Structure formats: C-alpha cells, structure tokens
Assembly symmetry: C3
C-alpha cells in the first residue's frame, strides 16, 4: 500500500493541530521552542547529507548514457525550454506585482560566472566564492555553502568525456551507475523516517509565529504569490505541453501526482528525484534516457518558481519603503534576483541567503527579511511543487521532440 | 623473526633511559625540548593520516560481507555486549572512585545526536559541529576535528545497501575490498618505521616532566585507575567469556598477546586492527566474517576504558575542589563523560578535548587538566590495551553465539 | 593543422599590441583595469581546477605501471639527476649574482618535512600546515593552499602498494588509468579555449605597468636572470645529455619544441604534461613507461628554474638594502629559497608566496616584492620553459640508463 504518503498527510494534519493547540494553550520560552523542533532539524540534516552524491552521480550517469552525436540536440532543447519558461514566469510575476500593488550587480554576475569554474574540486563541495569592492580594488574570499553550479558543470563535462571514451571509460560508467542506485536506496531509507520529522517541522513552524497579526498585515502578498504560482502551473505549462505534444496535459499531471505531493511535502526537488523518475517512466510512457538526462538538469537550473516568488517579494519590499521605482529598476531587480539563484535550485532553502545577497546588491535594506520570513514555510512548498511539475512537462516535451535521436540509438 | 616487536621493546627501554639521563644531567630550554620530540610527532602524524580510509573501507567491507537476512542479529549481539561491558565498567569505576577517595548536558547529548547525521560528507572528514546557548538562543558552528561517528554511520548504511544490491553493487564491493587491503599494507609500511618514533616519544614524555613531585602528589589516582583497569581486564572480561563460551579465557589472551603488546605500544586500537585481525583469525580459530565485522565496531564504540579513566579523573578533579557531590551528580558526570567520547574511541588522543568539553559542561573549572596531563602517557596505553582485549573477547563471544547464522551462509 | 599554437601566437602578439595601445591612448581606473582582465582570470581558474586529479592519477598510474623489483633503480636515477641539475643551477645562479652585482630557517625545514606527511588526506587537498615560535613555544595552524607534496608522497606509496598487490589491485589500477585518460581529455578541452584567455592576460599584464621607468631601473636584474636561464638551457643541459646519451641534443630539443612553446605560453609544467607525453613518445622514440613515470616527478620536484630565479631575486633584494652579506649568508639564502618551493613546482604561481615566506624567514623586509612583481609575467614563462626542457632531457637520460630494467619487463 501507499503507507508513506498517507502517513505523511496524517502527520501534516496532526502537526498543524499540535502547533495550534500548543500555541493557544501553552506558553514556551525560546529555548523550549528550539527544543520542540529537534526532529525536524534532524530530518533536514539527513536530507541535506544526501544531496551531493545523488546529484553528482545522477548527472554523470544521465550524460554518459547518451550517444556522443546526440546529446547536443537534447541539451539544446532542454536549455531552450527552461529559458522560455523562466522568461514567461518573469514577465508574469512583474505584471502581477505591478498591477496588484501589495505594498554591485556586475560583481554578482561576475561571481556567478566565477563559481561555474571553481579553483578546487574538493573545496567546491562545501565552500563558495564571493568578491566585494573596497577602497577601488576587488577582494575575494571563500565562504561556507556548497557550490552546486561548479560541481554540475564539472559532472556534465566529465560525463561527456567518459561517454565518448568508450571501452576505456566503461569502468567509470559502471562505478557511477552503481553509486547512483545506492544513493537512491539510501534516499528511500530516509523517506521511511520522513513523516515524524515533517510533523514536528510543521508544529515548530506554526509555533514560531507569535504576533498572529502578521498574516493580516501581509495581505495581497500571499494573494499575489499564490495567484502567480497557480496561473503558471494551471494555465501556461499545460498550454505549452498541449501545443508541443498534442495530448491531454491533465492526464500527465494525474500520473505525476505522487511526485507532486512528495515535493509539496518535503520542499526539495532534488530529494523527490526517485519518485519523479518512477512516475515519469512507469505512469507515463516516457523514454528512460530522456528522463534520466532532463530531470537532474531541471532540478538544478529551473527558475520559474524563484522568478514568481523571490522577485515578487523583493518588489514588495521595495514598495514597502517609499522608494517609487521605474520600469528599468523593476526589470533589473527581477533579473538580478532570478539569476542570482541559478546554482542552488534543488537543495532545500530556508534562510534565503541568495535573496539577502540580492537585497544587499540592489541597495535595499537587509533588515526587511523578517517581515516575510514567517510565510516562507507555506510558499516554498508550492514553489517546489510547480518547479517539479515544470520539470516533468519538460521531460515530456523533449521526449516528444527527440523522435529521430531516439530512433538512431535503437 | 619478530624483529618489529623486539625492536620496539628495546626502543622503549632505550627511550626511558635516554629521557631519565637527559633530564638528570642536561638542562634544555622549551624550544630544545620541542625539537627533541620531532620524530615522535612525525610518527603520530603518519598514524593520524591513515585512520580515515582504513576505518571507512573496513566498515564498508565488513558490513557488505554478511548476508542481508543475517547481519541484524550479529549487530544486535555486538551492541548488547558493548553496552553491558560499558555499564559494568561505569559501575566499577564509580564504586572504586567513591571508596578510595583519592582527592549544558542536554546540549552535549543533542550535539552527539547531531553529529550522527552530518550535513556534508566531505566536511565531516575534518570538521565537527557544536552548539552553545547565548543571550536564550542556540548558535551552532563547525570546528576542526574528524567526525568519525557520522562517517561510521554512513559507512554502515552504505555497506548494507550495496550488500543488498547484489550483482549491481559487486563493483563497489570489489573496489572497497581492494582499498581495505591497500590501506592495511600501508599501515604495515608505517609499522616498519614506528620504533624510532616510539623511542623519541617516550624520551620526550619523560623529559617534559619538570617538578618530579607531581607523581608523589598524584597518589591514589594512579592506583585507582590502574586497579580499575586491571580488575576489568583480569576478572570481569574472562568471567564473561567463560560464562558464554565454555573455554579457557587465558589461552585466548595468550593468542592475542601480540596485538595486546602492539596496542600497548602505539596506544591506537584502530591502528592495531591488522595485527588483531591476524591474531584472532590465525592464533584463534574465529570465523573471518565475525572478526571483520565486529572488530571495527569495537574500535569505534568501545567505552570501558573511557569509563574507567576519564570518568574517574573527572570525579577526582571534582573531589580536589571542596565541591562535595551527591549520588546523582556523580552518576551524571560519569554518564556525560562516557557518552561524550562515543565518536572517537580508536583514534589517538593526547589533548583529551572530549574531557575538556565534559568539564566545561559539568561546570567544573577547565584549568585543572594540567594536574593530570603528565600521567596521561602512561595510562592511555593501558586503556587502549584493555579496549582491544575487550574487542577480541567480544569477537569470540559473538562468534560463539552466531552458530546458526554462520551455518546458513554455508 | 596546428591551429591552437598559431592561434595562441597570434593572440599573444594581438594582446601585446592591445595592451600597448590601451596604455598609450586610454586612461582607466583600477576597477576598469581589474574588469579588463576577467577572461585571463577565468582561464587561470580553469587551469587551477584540473591540477589535482591530473597529477594524482598520473603519479599513481606511472608508479603502478612498473615492476616491483625495477622501480627502485628508476626512481633512484631520477632523484640523482634532479639533485645534480638543481645543484648545478644553484652554483651558477650564485656565481652570476655575485659577479654581475645588479643591486627561523629550522622552522621552515621542519614544516617542509611536516607537509610530507599530512594529518588528513581530504584537508591536504586545499590546506597547508605552518608553525611559528612565540613567547618560547611553537604554535602551528592550517592555512589555505593545496599540499601537493603530501599528496604526491601518498600517491607514490599507494601506487607502489597496488602495483605489488597484483590481481587484487587490478581494479584500482584500471580505475586510475581511466581517470588519467579522462583528465587528459578535459585538459585538451580547456586548451581549446586557452588562446583568448592568454590574449587578455597579456593585455592586462602590460596595462598594469604604470611607471614605465621600472624596467629601466631594473637593469642587470633581467639580464642576470635571463643569462642564467639561457646558459642553463643551452649549455649545461645539452652537454649532460650528450655526455650520458651519445646523441645530438638539439634534435631532441627540436622534437620537444611543441611542448616547449606550450609551456612558455601557459607557464604551467603540470598543464603541459599531455603535450610533453605526446612529443616525448612520438617525436622521440622514448619508452612509454619511463616517460609516464619520470615526467610527473619532474613536474613536481624540478628546482633548476626556482634556483635560477627566486634565489637571484632574493640576493638582488638583499643587495638593494645596504646589508653586505658573506659567503655563508648567500649560500643559506639560496638553499632556503630553493628548498622552500619543493612542493609546488608545477602549479601556476603568480603571488610568489613561497618567496615571501623565504624573505620573512631570512629576516629581509617583505615589502620589496613590489619592485620585482612587475617583471614576473615575463620571467616565469621562461622559467617554466627551461623546467620542462630539463624534464624531457631527464626522461631521455633515464631511458638510456635503464636498458637492463626495460629488458627484464619484456
């Protein structure tokens, strides 16, 4: 049976009830509040532990599985699809935030390019590079935080090289195939424990809210973000799927419902990858090669949810201050916020350090994060859900458009 | 011939003579004293270098060698045996320190649980996590020091997964078998050079003592620690072995004498692992699978020596201050000190950072370490000797109790 | 065709022209000067990224390819040749700097020995150990910077062990062979992009010079360094080659011209390794085993260029100050400067941190580096060229002297 998903839904409702009841009838200190959310912290720690080998081995295996003379077209189609979806999401978010009205960059882009080619493979696993101008000379240094962008680029190049090697790279191909399978099984073992961590995480999230008037004050900001995400998930993506693939998009969404729920629950596209693989390969008759190549790329560089969430939050923050913007300032903020997070799109994010960096770069005060940090728990899950839905639709579209390429391999 | 052990014994006696003669007839500055112990520092550095791959590959290989439907009972028996021995050692140490009379915790336990599941596999190889309460909110950060506990847990889970994989994980199994053999050979190469390092280490240890009245002042503390270790090694462990295995325990100890001497000399259970393997498999007719699985686990979570040494030292320090304790305070100190070192029990320890953390947590002053740091050289070697003796007895007991399981594999 | 080398030469001349024209006709701020050299920084970053796996896998593969009973003599001959060449270079540099007249150590040597045996394999990939005396007690700590010396020693020991293992180490041998080939191919991919980075690097180097009288002031220092390098490359090395191998040394140099140009262009002996392999194995009929073993060792511990460059620069700096030296002080400075860089001789060096450490140790002021940092761009390339020429001549000499050993393998 599907005991994991039912248990997780029961844990979610029980955690909501527990948080509400404890907040209403019990008074706890800050230390007790921190101690009440320990299982959720343990679950988040376990989820973080498995991100590196899973994504690295999946990328290498997916790239190496394709023929040398074929992978270029598939990759080109994937990047074109993701760029188009990100542009549409950016436009929709800008239009919605302008209409509803709810309420340094060069260094950031150069750092983004710098992180694509790290100076140390081992150091990139837990550290990132950043520069700042001081009196003017540029000074750079390394700070904690996994450099997923550089590891993904190196993994892609390495997978291409060992796929083109042939008989001399077969041992590496087999090694990374076995590593990918082992990481998948370990992820399943962690999924076994997930529900209790989710229960306590929801209870702690609800308990941490103290004012209870922040939700009332944050009117039309939740409405704006939710409306943008709903429009993107329900209208634009199914229309693109039907236009390219002459098939019903909602049967496709019905097949992926299990992965959609899982992603909505753990809020981690990279973690959900095994369920997405299974749903896309079994429930829908999508080729294994296309799925295994496209899905990690989507979990890495999908920016529709970021464009519909962080960009809107930034424009709302700028609107809170009497800092009336122009068309250029709004477009610059949306571009900076969307581009600054291109590296880490699958890892779980709670502190929104990328958006803090964006706020610092665009000159806005960095102390306004607290006014929206309370509702991040609710919004991030829907962001991840729409991200994985877009990834699945992209796998379907690329499989549709790669008929000749998949014919040559046979 | 056995030229390594005879050479090491000759080096030990020559180092004792050299240290005594240099202290008596020569006067050296602090810088010259530091320069006199350089070869011992080099030997310790080389021993530290080989701890990670050896323990990781040994754990993976030992776990993967067992059948999937069998390893649960073997692991359960091993943990039960180690828990029982640790409890007996704790009780004996408490009783002895109370009778002879020679002279924050929640955060520590939560950190112990946190380190079982690190957030980064690469970072866990050289860094550890720690939290502290400040004005109250909890703040955590990473500090230098290998996280053996997390690596051991991940290695166990990975070994189980790849053992259950079968034909798809055979390549990883072969890879880690070869890695384990290579690490063993490198350890043997280091053992070739060991004796000169031991000579200079003993000479430097003896030279560093300056007062020469600290030994007289530290009366009944050496007596207490040595009596506890001797009682545990000579009475309790052989009695348990004879009760479970109806055989003479001293022939077993006679067979393991080579590994016992080696462990007494280098004071590193993990380093002694190859000699322990050879003695337990050849001198005693113990099954290879049981040995290869139990011995790394013992080298990792054996706490009898820690309970008989650090706990007693802590109670002695608390007795030095006019800080008359109760039964609860003594039991809390013994439990905290024993549990805080569960991660690093095989690596060489000289600075006793774990006991410093324990003293900080139990509210005792941290400046009293110097009064006992002088005799650590002598006591740590006997602690390691009794630890490896307990590990060997545990291998024998588990092999005795696993007759049906070892019958199914055949 | 040879489009890469011709494109790189055209890029070099175009970068020289661009730098001269921009300096003469345009005025730029410091920030614009930094932004003008971004592609060169990206190229240097990519070159740095590939140094670790390439050198590690090449060392392991080269050591493991040789028979167990043979590799000792080959290694002995290689070390003897490198020691003799370094001694001759030291003598020549000292004599030239004394005649032309253009213008703490114990801790350094002990740190050099300490870095040969690191305490952590993972930490050695990006960190180094250093000690300092303070009031006297010695305090050590770790700082950023790859520890190539320790990794090379561990790789050599590991390669010997797995070569002696045989059928049980064949899987590791195959794994590292495949890894070496993959790293070579990735290096070739980077070489594809190299020329534009070289163009912008030369343009930025030329632009950064502002006084334009520093070249006139630095008279007889360029002359001394260039004369020493030219004498070493043209006279001493061909004479040694002809004395040992009764063959024309200039046909050998003509065969290696492609690798010589490449090394002169990128100034990185380790990066040039694939071209050196191809030229030495195809253009000259040198045995593959001798080449694959000797060349990484030369790229790691070749000190002729360092002895002819850093030692002379240090003596020139000491001559600038009215600090008249003796024979012992000059020999101590040359020995310290040559020995302090034994670890990193193949990686690209621009900041000359090793020479800064040498200046700090020998008591000379550390602020005089700026007076010679301007001409480092020009001199380092010739230093690397003579280093790779010496490495190739060493491969030839060792192949000549290893006739019996290469006969036994057949």
């Amino acid at each position: 049976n599907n005991w994991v998903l039912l248990s997780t839904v029961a844990a979610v409702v029980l955690g909501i009830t527990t948080g509400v009841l404890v907040r209403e009838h019990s008074n706890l200190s800050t230390l007790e509040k921190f101690y009440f959310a320990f299982p959720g912290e343990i679950l988040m720690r376990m989820l973080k532990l498995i991100i590196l080998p899973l994504i690295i081995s999946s990328m290498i295996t997916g790239v190496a599985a394709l023929d040398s003379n074929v992978s270029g077209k598939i990759g080109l189609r994937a990047v074109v699809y993701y760029f188009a979806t990100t542009l549409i999401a950016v436009i929709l978010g800008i239009v919605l935030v302008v209409s509803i009205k709810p309420g340094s960059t060069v260094d950031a882009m150069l750092d983004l390019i710098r992180n694509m080619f790290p100076e140390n493979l081992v150091q990139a696993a837990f550290q990132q590079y950043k520069t700042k101008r001081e009196e003017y000379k540029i000074v750079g240094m390394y700070s904690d935080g996994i450099n997923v962008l550089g590891l993904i680029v190196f993994a892609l190049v390495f997978g291409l090289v060992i796929g083109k090697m042939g008989e001399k790279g077969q041992i590496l191909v087999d090694f990374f195939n076995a590593l990918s399978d082992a990481t998948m099984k370990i992820v399943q073992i962690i999924m076994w424990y997930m529900p209790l961590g989710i229960l306590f995480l929801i209870a702690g999230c609800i308990i941490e809210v103290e004012d209870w008037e922040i939700f009332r004050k944050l009117g039309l900001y939740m409405a704006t973000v939710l409306t943008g995400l709903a429009i993107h998930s329900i209208v634009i993506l199914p229309l693109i799927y039907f236009i390219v693939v002459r098939k019903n998009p909602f049967r496709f969404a019905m097949g992926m419902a299990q992965a959609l729920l899982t992603a909505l629950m753990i809020s981690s596209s990279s973690a959900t990858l095994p369920v997405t693989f299974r749903c896309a390969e079994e429930n829908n008759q999508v080729d294994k090669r296309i799925t295994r190549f496209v899905l990690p790329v989507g979990a890495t560089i999908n920016m529709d949810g970021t464009a519909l969430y962080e960009a809107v939050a930034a424009v709302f923050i700028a609107q809170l201050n009497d800092l009336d913007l122009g068309i250029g300032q709004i477009i610059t903020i949306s571009i900076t916020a969307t581009s600054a997070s291109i590296g880490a799109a699958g890892v779980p994010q709670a502190g929104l350090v990328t958006m803090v960096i964006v706020l610092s770069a665009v000159g806005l005060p960095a102390e306004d994060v607290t006014l929206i940090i309370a509702v991040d728990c609710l919004l991030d899950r829907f962001r991840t859900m729409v991200n994985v839905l877009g990834d699945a639709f992209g796998t379907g579209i690329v499989e549709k458009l790669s008929k000749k390429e998949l014919e040559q391999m046979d």
